[PDB]
């Protein structure tokens, strides 16, 4: 957990409905998004951060949490949008004599910033007496090994955790769900869906001066008034179709 692995996912179509076939977990824990809607969205990037904790600490893998893990080992941002997947791995990560291949950081001078990894093995100095790298009074070793055994209770058994963080920026989308894209229809009232941005309106050719890095435009009420087509990089103006009041 103190040296949690991180993998970057980009330039691919992500089908989140096969994640049930890879790990024997019971449900997602998705913050800011719903697990069933993941296949209908495009994200600029995905990050899969994997590690092992024990049962008690699975509750700490969540935005706004505090503890040993959330402070010194693995911290999630308060504005987190993603999904946490944790499953019991007592059959794999537990030995009869004890599994001491998994460790956690117990002491640290200050709390971790979100998504910060600290792999320093320096001796922690609780007091003022210098340690000079040697354990002693008020000189602790910050890393402590979990002792995982098959006879431990469900709260003390190992749990494998994978955190998926969805970077949804203004950049062009790179990770999308399986979704076939139809032909572009202009000058007609249609239900459009650009990279998961859904709406209803009339799409017209535009002469707005989008800079090469921009991808969409907003309005006074933060309503998307222009878009960039993901395939043919042109600028489309979105207009409400047609409506009015009718008096008798």
């Amino acid at each position, epitope marked *: 957990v103190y040296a949690w692995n991180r993998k970057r996912i980009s330039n691919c179509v992500a089908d989140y409905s096969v994640l049930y076939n890879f790990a024997p977990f019971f449900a997602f824990k998705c913050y800011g998004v719903s697990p069933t809607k993941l296949n209908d969205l495009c994200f600029t990037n995905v990050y899969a951060d994997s590690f092992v904790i024990r049962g008690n600490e699975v509750s700490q893998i969540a935005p706004g949490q505090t503890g040993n893990i959330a402070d010194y080992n693995y911290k999630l941002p308060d504005d987190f949008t993603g999904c946490v997947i944790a499953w019991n791995s007592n059959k794999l990560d537990s030995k009869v004599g*004890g599994n001491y291949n998994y460790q956690y950081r117990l002491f640290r001078k200050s709390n971790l910033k979100p998504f910060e990894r600290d792999i320093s*093995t320096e001796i922690y100095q609780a007091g003022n007496k210098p340690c*000079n*790298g040697v*354990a*002693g009074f*008020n000189c602790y*070793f910050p*890393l402590r090994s979990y002792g995982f055994r098959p006879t431990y209770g469900v709260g003390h058994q190992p749990y494998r955790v994978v955190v998926l963080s969805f970077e949804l920026l203004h950049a062009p989308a790179t990770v999308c769900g399986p979704k076939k894209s139809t032909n572009l229809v202009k000058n007609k009232c249609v239900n459009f869906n650009f990279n998961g941005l859904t709406g209803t309106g009339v799409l017209t050719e535009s002469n707005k001066k989008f800079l090469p890095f921009q991808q969409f435009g907003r309005d006074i009420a933060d309503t998307t008034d222009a878009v960039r087509d993901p395939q043919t990089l042109e600028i489309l103006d979105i207009t409400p179709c047609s409506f009015g009041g009718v008096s008798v």
Partner: antibody
Amino acid sequence: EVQLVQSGAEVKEPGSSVKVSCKASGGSFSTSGISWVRQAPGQGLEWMGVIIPIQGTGNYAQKFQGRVTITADESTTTVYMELSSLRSDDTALYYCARDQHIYDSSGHGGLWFDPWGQGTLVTVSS
Amino acid sequence: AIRMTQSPSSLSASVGDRVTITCRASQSISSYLNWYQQKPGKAPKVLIYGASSLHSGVPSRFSGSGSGTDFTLTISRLQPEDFATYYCQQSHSSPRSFGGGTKVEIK
């Protein structure tokens, strides 16, 4: 508990170096300090240095710095101590021991060396 | 830079007697003192760690106390197998300085 097994005896000459192995049976490796304590014939014990295998380096007392090198082989679960520039005062029994360091919440309880090797008699022949 | 001083260096007692050994530190080490028992030809064994705790398997006759700079190891009833050399070690800070060692002999 954990069992420590060292190598055999050594016969050397002043100006040479000696490498002593200490294989741990196992159970907390890469987090347990493998301390080395030497004992001169008819004299008291003396602490040379300690190594935590995950640190990579080795810490030593302010009497052996500069001529003691301790390294750990994680794959073989063996700790190696290399004492260079041997002299007459380097003939002793060389033990390897494992620290525990149980602390409750304030400083109660300290370190102790429960497992000791059988001892590696190193003789610096003249 | 912490030194440990023992007293006495060699005491001769009988079986069933009470033995008191003192271990003094130059400066306060809290409760990071240990007591080791070494028999000739063998590696030392732990009897007291933390100045007040008994290791697993240690007979109840051994008892340690004290804190700061004054410490004491006490054997309530001496035994024929309790004649050995006793070393007190401080775990406060590097270096771990062993005491001069007290040798308990048969009267």
